Amino acid sequence: HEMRAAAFSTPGLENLKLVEAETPRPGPGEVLIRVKYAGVNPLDYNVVAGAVKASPMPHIPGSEFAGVVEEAGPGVTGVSRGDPVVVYNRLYCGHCRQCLTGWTQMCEVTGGGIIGIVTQGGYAEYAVVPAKNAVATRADLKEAATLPIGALTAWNMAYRASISPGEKVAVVGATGNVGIYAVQFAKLLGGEVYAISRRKAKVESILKSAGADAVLTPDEAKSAAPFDVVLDPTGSASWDLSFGVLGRGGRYVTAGALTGAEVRLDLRRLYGMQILVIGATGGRRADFNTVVRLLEAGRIKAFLHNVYPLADVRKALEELRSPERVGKVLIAP
Amino acid sequence: HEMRAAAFSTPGLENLKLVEAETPRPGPGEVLIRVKYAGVNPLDYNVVAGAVKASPMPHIPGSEFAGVVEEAGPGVTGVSRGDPVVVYNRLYCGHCRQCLTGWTQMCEVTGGGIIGIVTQGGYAEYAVVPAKNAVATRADLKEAATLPIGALTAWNMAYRASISPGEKVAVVGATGNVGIYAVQFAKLLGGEVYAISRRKAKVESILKSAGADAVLTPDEAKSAAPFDVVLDPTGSASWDLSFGVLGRGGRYVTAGALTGAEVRLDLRRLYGMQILVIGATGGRRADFNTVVRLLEAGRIKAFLHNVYPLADVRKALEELRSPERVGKVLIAP
Amino acid sequence: HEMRAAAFSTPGLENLKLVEAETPRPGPGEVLIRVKYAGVNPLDYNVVAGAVKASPMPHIPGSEFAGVVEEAGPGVTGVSRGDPVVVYNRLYCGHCRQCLTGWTQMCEVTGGGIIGIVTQGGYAEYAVVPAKNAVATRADLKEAATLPIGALTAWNMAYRASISPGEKVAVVGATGNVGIYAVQFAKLLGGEVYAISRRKAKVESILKSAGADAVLTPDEAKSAAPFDVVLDPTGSASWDLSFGVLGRGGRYVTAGALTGAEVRLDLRRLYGMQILVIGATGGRRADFNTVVRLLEAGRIKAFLHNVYPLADVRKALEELRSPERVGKVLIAP
Amino acid sequence: HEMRAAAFSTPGLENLKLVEAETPRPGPGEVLIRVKYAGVNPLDYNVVAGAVKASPMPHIPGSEFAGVVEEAGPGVTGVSRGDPVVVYNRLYCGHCRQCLTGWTQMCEVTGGGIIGIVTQGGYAEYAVVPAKNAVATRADLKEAATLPIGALTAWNMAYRASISPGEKVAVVGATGNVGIYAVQFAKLLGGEVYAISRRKAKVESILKSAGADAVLTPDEAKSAAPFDVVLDPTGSASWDLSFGVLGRGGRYVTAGALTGAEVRLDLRRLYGMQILVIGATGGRRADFNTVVRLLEAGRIKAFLHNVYPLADVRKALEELRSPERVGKVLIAP
Ligand SMILES: [Cl-]
Ligand SMILES: [Cl-]
Ligand SMILES: [Cl-]
Ligand SMILES: [Zn+2]
Ligand SMILES: [Zn+2]
Ligand SMILES: [Zn+2]
Ligand SMILES: [Zn+2]
């Protein structure tokens, strides 16, 4: 039993090719998912490019996916064949200090391991995941496939920012997969939301439909400072802008896609203004349930740009960088 | 100089009468306000009715008002004649533990004294208040006059409820002045908002327009339980309903208009479900600024019913008890 | 195929019932629409009440709706499955004197027939309409569903009033579906706009956000006369209070919802002041395109009160007459 | 009795000198105005330069002014000493075909004579004008002085263009005195307004505050064609670049300041697209009242660059041609 998959034997986008792979089988506590849609994210790009080591090798990437349960492993209850599911992408033990306080993405036993990085991922017709990671959903699976990275990372960022109604929130990288949900969550929490894009002219309507009160270029954002919160899911790419626009008590919530991100930090400005720089990665297992429910209720929206077949995975990854891309790129195995 | 005012020398609606009164004059730290609109609230009704002691006597009630600065007291700066203002209604010292942590409504020195209860109030052409209590505003003053009690009290309740996006929030008394802002603030903070009214057949749509996701009768609320949060500004009037629909970790935020309110509390159900019963009164001075800005920005809505002249203050207080429709009743001196 | 619909076999609101009905099939020149939102208007109420004879019987009402094309009939091009559309509600031939001069609502061949009155309408999951009546739009369909009656009728009234910048325009019934757009169009054309409402305090803020320069009661309008234009979408309801506020050269533009509208006209005042009484119904097909584009550009606004499910259509229609209501009621099949 | 005035005995700005002149006295039907502010316009520049013959000689120019009535001649009513007034600048008889149909700027008896061209004008402490040309105003006279030429010419252009809401209007010379009001009036009538300027980068924010939806260079406007209306107050200066941007039924409204303005017109393109080329000069006496009321109401705005004393009249005239001028130059005698 074979399946189609995109895999690399050595890092580099040039090495990501369509192959035939043995179809995996679920053991105890696991489910086999027929992948319907997989998200295309900076994280997946950087994994393929070798920013971090993947296992196993040769490696199928794809850390964000949704699909239909094909086979439940032994002992598995609560999910059966035919169930549409979307996959929480962190392996977690459920028994360590981090898991027991809800921070499952920080699990001490698995090391925070990400499905599709330390296991084979969703750029394939089938994938095996822990049954407790598969969340049943009534949402359209194209839309649900924007949740495990894009929406959940943005939720976790906004949660860790302590946004109060009235507060001015700048979202850097607001056109990106995480950023566009960060606009939505910051507005859902009561923020006055300023979405930052160099493409303001072209993307203004999309970002306002996501809840932005204003769409500013980076240079316009500097004139609109100060901000109470900056949500910046781009690593170090915009550090100078993000840090400088914060006011007293400002919170800079930082997330990234695992590229190197060393920056110059002025501690004196940080302590003089009582700024907090707040790291965020992934999201809590409980919050993933909340995000799925918000999507089902129409309270958040999935902004989609294009869907590619598996054979076009290289083209899909390169589309991340296209100036005409506004919204999510998906793979349909 | 003399002015027109509504005053009572002894309690009872029957004894509230339009009189001539000496126009007050502002001392150090004070401003004289030409009152443009004053709200008609249960608190004012209960003050006139004698359920709470007022001073001085004979007494001019009116704890919620907006107007134009007529005269600034000796030394007063930052507030000028002609400025339109809306009045924070708690006297606060700024130096005690409560004031210094931001809980100005809990001031240990003034005892939380409410303007128009321990001072002469706004049911008069002119009122004297502390200059630090007068907030300049560009909002229409009829809408501003809904903020000092209705909006601020609701803001404070929702703030004290720790509403997280996705949580199920029930608002009891949702058709009242506080309750209709509580609907708005629960939605502003990300709650899934269920407005509860015996009068759902008549008020469903107006409450949806305030932000409710659904409107339920009490019996429907019991069927839709559990709720994560109940916001109940009606004192003890719906205690059994509000307490019994809470689920695990539920927060019941309670506020009222100073009438007697003893209830039967089952501590075993409270601790078995880890419920919190949370008292709320007034609001923080800082939060009053935020509420004013939110109204000026159009992020919250003033639901108004009718404006009465001062000579019809008794008909205005009766309209509060038996309303032709939902919304704030105002007096215009 | 069967669909859910609200239908009546005999007039009366109590006879309007949820039924299963045969899903219609589009014939030549027609499209099948999956209705997303349908407006609730006085006209729909009067159809259900029997003030207006409807065909066929039993009858599915609903003359204002927007949705997504499901199927194109034989010979149809320019429109395909998936297209969001909003429906011009007048049947027109395109070849008569009226159609060829642009007055498609006055078509001599169809007799002006109104979709949902002489055809089955939009209070159902699906509806068939002429392909040339379906306008593709990128607007939110909830907002687009306010255009076929409310906005278009108001546009046609304002267009027929010859409003010049500076002219004083009174809008009666200004909070109704048509009236609230008539405020907007009178301001868009340069008029000085006085919205007339006896509920002044309740509705002043929404009417100012619609473009009113002032909100007056009917008695204040009498004191503020003369006006150059009255826009009256209320049939005969406001005539006796309003005709007398017009000055020399004044234009009284009348529209309505097909109930009886007999009034007494003082002809000597009419000719002595060179007043014009101008009938207005529906709107021109070309102007419907303009109105759609204005909504897409954010130059006009939909003011929404509540959306009901199809099962609650009776409550939706009764809400039309509610004292609590301000703004548009929609049905979502 | 003597006054200061700027007068020229021979054409050329270098010959416009401050002199001591006999203060005029008002005859029957005339008022003496103490000039407070006089506009500096291309027309005034071209009168001084000799492109337009003036009388009497030596000549006091200045065709656009506002001031205070100092003295009423015999038979003046409805205009009294002390009244702030702004002056309609066309002499008109009130009894010819043109005056009796409203086109007072086309008066057959006076020949369209312009105050300050065929009479001594407002670049002096005092000027005599017909009482019926003086309009009392409560607006600031510095802003009123922008109306007799700049605003009224723009009004008459936009009126003659039959602008309908939604129509695309290009304004050439949008930074000029007429053009900046043409932007406002085109927007006031509901047009989608594109302001054309080679100095786009520096004037963008000002033209947007005047109502422009976009600010384009001439070459950018070619790419945005077709337009329904071009408003061109610059004579022949922009014709070759602008006539071709018009679409079907387009209207090209032309005004100017009396210099040579011969152009090449392709009649075949004109009749093939049913284009109209529409001459506009001055404005109607009735429309001047409307424009004054619109300024008093804040519906139009005076955009001012600088005010100069009468001694600096030569600097003020040359500032018309400065690349750094954005807005009106005034003289204050
Ligand atoms: Cl991205
Ligand atoms: Cl209506
Ligand atoms: Cl100019
Ligand atoms: Zn763990
Ligand atoms: Zn204190
Ligand atoms: Zn026809
Ligand atoms: Zn004449």
Author numbering:
A (entry chain D), B (entry chain A), C (entry chain C), D (entry chain B): -1 to 331
Source paper text:
In the present work, our attention was focused on a thermostable ADH from the hyperthermophilic archaeon Pyrobaculum aerophilum (PyAeADHII). However, previous studies have revealed that PyAeADHII has peculiar characteristics because the enzyme lacked activity on most standard compounds used to test the activity of ADHs, and was active only when α-tetralone was used as a substrate. PyAeADHII, possessing only the structural Zn2+ site, may be a hybrid between Zn2+-dependent medium-chain ADHs and non- Zn2+ dependent SDRs.
Four molecules of ADH were found in the asymmetric unit with each monomer containing its own structural Zn2+. To confirm that the metal-binding sites in the wild-type enzyme were complexed to Zn2+, a low energy remote data set was collected using the same crystal at λ = 1.2480 Å. This distribution of proline residues in PyAeADHII may therefore contribute to its observed thermostability.
